């Protein structure tokens, strides 16, 4: 989780800035300030992220004439099979918030109406709720037979994947809109695609590009294999956010070492082994050799500017 | 220490039917508490917030919480402008509680938002004035620790002969009650901070009726049977006598008089009702096998930690079976204390 750690550390200045500039409940500040992390995993990364947020809100608190905030309540959300035991045992002893964990998909409601002041999600929202049905349909123009993911090179495949990403993100936004009070902030970080690029020439995309042929090395089951993820462009996020209506997009930007074949192969395996198993020795031996001969490509042909930062603000009334 | 986690045959989840009976018997008192004592006048919340202290791994906690939610919702719909829009239910236990198992057991089809909170209920767990109803079912007999005096070989309170406070040794009882008074008062102070004015605190715990001692309650007598099994294991050279002498559980079973004394001294709550429930298993014959597994699911951890088990519990099972008629004829069954408290308006 060290790369994801870096995203949070890179985003800290932005989070601090976002809260300093955009968090303002006017005459209606809470005594209990409530924060939720959507897709928290098992730590430590969620603890650093929540710590940075609490620190920023504390500064905000001190900045007001009559500091309104008495305490903090932080909620850690992940899927029901997340290892919450480990998360709980890892909670920082010295912290300034009451803590709770919440099981469930973040594509549903997870919290009471107008109970949240700030919502966060770091490196989670690229995970779709499912594979789009259309890319599985042998008779669709969107049949994604040649690849494990949306490369972005195929217009109809891209249509189906984006349709799913839009549906899922819009579901998330609707849910968070109900849970956040008016003026509440929603901070989102996820891997994406910078202007002038496509998924396939980002690191995550090209990794999938190397895997697809490895599987080809049952053909039928390879043709029907797809992953439930999407890496959006800034234009795509703006379309979804604008169509949604409940938030203003206060900021959307991309935040800023040699490729390690061995380490990457181990990390890639840990993330995707399950998906492959459900749909490994022989395969990841072939993948490790393929990453090996792709070092200079990762070093000098792949876009590394992929960490999207999104600050949204819950519209009033 | 938490109960046996997971969902196997030795687990708390699989062996806590007696405790579920306590919640079952409590249901009618919960309905009366809501009907009679839950009243926020013209400041009812839109989000009704409930916390369960000592929830374990389910399914009992989900049962207790569903009964409360339904009662409150019935009340809600009986108001001309039903004020409550949603429910938020918090599940609290120690940090080593098997929350993974708890969460896999939580109903995915339900009418309340849910969260779990790790930590000792002798500390603050929630923001100030955030809760409308606090629940604790068969948890508040657990002390924050064994009293220091009973571990002290030079003290008159040295509890060398028993695993718990029987009530028969005066110095041991003094040491244990002092700890209970301190602990429960600390629990009530913390809950007083967390509950809004007029909020309810609903409690059940194992206690002692008038004219009895811990010794001749089910909880006490099961410990009376454990002590000699440990002594026997020491005689047979599996553990040391020294280790037996030093073994004590952090538990106290109070009388109503004791509870009233602690409550009255605390001052943050009015005592709206204190009564002994009629347990639904009251008229059933003792079941040694099932009681053995119940008892194991609770105390296995304590024994493991102190002594560093299968053979012990085989011996224990034998003693339970042998003592069937004692449980059936000589043990007080009027032992499930129900307590309703109401946070005073500050
Ligand atoms: N629909 C969903 N609902 C809740 N959690 C989800 C989810 N889809 C994915 N996740 C979780 O999101 C996490 C992505 S990994 C990111 C962990 C952490 N936020 C960090 O920055 O390091 C995983 O723990 C995954 O289980
Ligand atoms: N200091 C403390 N803080 C929180 N939970 C505690 C505690 N001491 C004991 N407990 C918990 O209280 C529970 C007692 S068993 C009762 C479980 C449940 N309410 C039921 O009705 O079955 C255990 O889960 C134990 O771990
Ligand atoms: O939930 C618990 O912690 C327990 C739950 O139930 C307790 O035992 C029960 O204690 C009850 C109270 O005396 C009896 O009526 C029951 O027969 C008996 O099974 C366990 C016990 C035995 O020494 C002490 C406390 C423990
Ligand atoms: Mg495919
Ligand atoms: Mg002893």
| Pocket lining: B297 vs ligand 2, CB cutoff 6 Å | no
Q: Separation of B165 CA from ligand 5 center, angstroms?
A: 9
Sign of the four-CA dihedral B14, B16, B21, B23: negative
Number of other residues whose CB lies within 10 A of the CB of residue A315: 14
Residue for token pair 């947020």:
A53
DSSP-assigned letter for residue A140: S
Residue A195 structure tokens: 């202007």
The reply to whether B5 falls in a domain is no
Residue A207 structure tokens: 């990794």
User: What is the helix (H) or strand (E) element at residue A288, kind and residue range?
Assistant: helix A281-292
The reply to whether B9 falls in a domain is no
Residues B262 and B185: beta-carbon distance below 8 Å: yes
Distance CA B119, CA B135 (A): 16
- Rg of chain B's alpha carbons, rounded to an integer? 20
Looking from the CA of B139 toward its CB, the CA atoms found within 13 Å total: 25
Distance CA B30, CA B81 (A): 23
Residue B66 structure tokens: 């569903």
The reply to whether B150 falls in a domain is yes
Q: Do B114 and A99 touch (CB under 8 A)?
A: no
Would you put residue A33 in left (φ > 0), alpha (ψ -120 to 50) or beta?
beta
Q: Do A81 and B104 touch (CB under 8 A)?
A: yes
Protein residues within 5 Å, CB atom, of ion ligand 4: A 144, 226
Residue B180 structure tokens: 């209970």
Number of other residues whose CB lies within 10 A of the CB of residue A121: 22
Residues B250 and B146: beta-carbon distance below 8 Å: yes
**Which of A19, A105, A14 shows the shortest CA–CA distance to A56?**
A19
Residue B24 structure tokens: 């079952």
Beta bridge partners of A116: A180
User: What is the helix (H) or strand (E) element at residue A164, kind and residue range?
Assistant: helix A155-179
Cis peptide leading into residue A44 (ω within 30°) = yes
The 3-state DSSP class for residue A27 equals: coil
Residues A211 and A287: beta-carbon distance below 8 Å: yes
Residues B97 and B166: beta-carbon distance below 8 Å: no
Distance CA B252, CA A282 (A): 60
Q: Do B127 and A75 touch (CB under 8 A)?
A: no
The reply to whether B326 falls in a domain is yes
Least CB–CB distance from A73: residue in B96, B118, B127: B127
Experimental technique behind these coordinates: X-ray
Best probe residue, ligand 1, of A2, A124, A164 (max atoms within 8 Å of C-beta): A124
Q: Do A71 and B103 touch (CB under 8 A)?
A: no
DSSP-assigned letter for residue A135: G
Burial category of A93 from C-beta neighbours within 10 Å (exposed 0-12, middle 13-18, buried 19 and up):
exposed
Counting from 1 in the atom list of ligand 1, the atom nearest the Cα of A40 is 19
Distances (CA, A) of A264 to A141, A211, A288, B253: 33, 13, 9, 58
**HEC states along chain B?**
CCCCCCCCCCCCCCCCHHHHHHHHHHHHHHHHHHHHHCCCCCCCCCEEEEEEECCCCCCHHHHHHHHHHHHHHHHHHCCCCCCCCEEEEEEEECCCCCHHHHHHHCCCCCCCEEEEEECCCCCCCCCCCCEEEEEEECCCCECCCCCHHHHCCCCCCCCCCCCCCCCCCHHHHHHHHHHHHHHHHHHHHHHHHHEEEEEEEEEEEECECCCCCHHHEHHHHHHHHHHHHHHHHHHCCCCCHHHHHHCCCCECCCEHHHHHHHHHHHCCEEEEEEEECCCCCCCCCCCHHHHHHHHHHHHHHHHHHHHCCHHHHHHHHHHHHHCHHHHHHCCECCCEEEEEEEECCC
**CA triple B79-B80-B83, angle to 5 deg:** 60
The 3-state DSSP class for residue A253 equals: strand
Distances (CA, A) of A61 to A25, A33, A65, A310: 11, 10, 9, 23
**Residue partners of A83: CB distance under 8 A and separation at least 6:** A42, B100
The reply to whether B76 falls in a domain is yes
Distance CA B233, CA B230 (A): 5
Distance CA B15, CA B18 (A): 8
Domain count, chain B: 1
Domain encompassing residue B45 = 17-343
Beta bridge partners of B274: B339
Which residues from chain B sit within 8 angstroms of residue A98, using beta carbons?
117, 124-127
What is the resolution in angstroms? 2.0
Looking from the CA of B148 toward its CB, the CA atoms found within 13 Å total: 0
- Point out the ligand nearest to the CA of residue A168: 1
Beta bridge partners of A185: A118, A313
Residue for token pair 């009907």:
B35
Residues B202 and B65: beta-carbon distance below 8 Å: no
Which residues from chain A sit within 8 angstroms of residue B103, using beta carbons?
80, 84, 101, 103
Q: Output phi, psi for B21, to 5 deg.
A: -60, -35
The reply to whether B241 falls in a domain is yes
- Return the CATH number at B73: 3.40.50.150
Question: Beta strands A307-314 and B336-343: pairing type?
Answer: unpaired
User: What is the helix (H) or strand (E) element at residue A158, kind and residue range?
Assistant: helix A155-179
The reply to whether B10 falls in a domain is no
The reply to whether B7 falls in a domain is no
**Which of A245, A239, A255 shows the shortest CA–CA distance to A192?**
A255
Distance CA A247, CA B258 (A): 56
Question: Beta strands A32-38 and A71-78: pairing type?
Answer: parallel
Distance CA B188, CA B181 (A): 11
What b/e readout covers B31-48, taking b as 16+ CB neighbours within 10 angstroms? bebbeeebeeeeebeebb
């Amino acid at each position: 989780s060290s790369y994801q750690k870096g995203v949070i550390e890179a985003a800290k200045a932005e989070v601090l800035l976002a809260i300093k500039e955009k968090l303002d409940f006017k005459t209606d500040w809470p005594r209990t300030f409530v924060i939720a992390d959507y897709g928290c995993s098992t730590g430590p990364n969620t603890f650093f992220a929540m710590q940075n947020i609490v620190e920023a809100v504390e500064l905000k608190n001190k900045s007001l004439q009559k500091p309104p905030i008495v305490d903090f309540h932080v909620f850690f959300n992940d899927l029901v099979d997340n290892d919450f035991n480990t998360l709980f045992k890892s909670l920082p002893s010295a912290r300034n918030y009451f803590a709770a964990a919440v099981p469930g998909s973040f594509y549903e409601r997870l919290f009471p109406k107008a109970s949240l002041h700030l919502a966060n999600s770091s490196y989670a929202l690229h995970w779709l709720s499912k594979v789009p049905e259309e890319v599985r349909d042998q008779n669709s123009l969107a049949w994604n037979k040649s690849r494990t993911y949306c490369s972005g090179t195929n217009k109809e495949v891209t249509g189906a994947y984006f349709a799913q990403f839009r549906k899922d993100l819009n579901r998330f936004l609707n849910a968070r809109a109900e849970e956040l009070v008016g003026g509440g902030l929603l901070v989102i970080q996820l891997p994406g695609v910078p202007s002038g690029a496509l998924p396939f020439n980002t690191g995550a995309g090209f990794l999938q590009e190397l895997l697809g042929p490895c599987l080809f090395e049952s053909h039928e089951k390879v043709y029907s294999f797809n992953l439930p993820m999407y890496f959006p462009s800034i234009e795509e996020l703006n379309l979804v956010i604008k169509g949604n209506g409940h938030f203003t997009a206060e900021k959307i930007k991309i935040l800023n070492l040699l490729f390690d074949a061995k380490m990457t192969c181990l990390q890639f395996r840990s993330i995707f082994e399950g998906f492959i198993k459900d749909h490994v020795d022989q395969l990841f031996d072939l993948y490790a050799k393929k990453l090996e001969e792709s070092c200079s490509i990762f070093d000098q042909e792949i876009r590394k500017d992929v960490d999207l930062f999104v600050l949204l603000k819950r519209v009033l009334e």
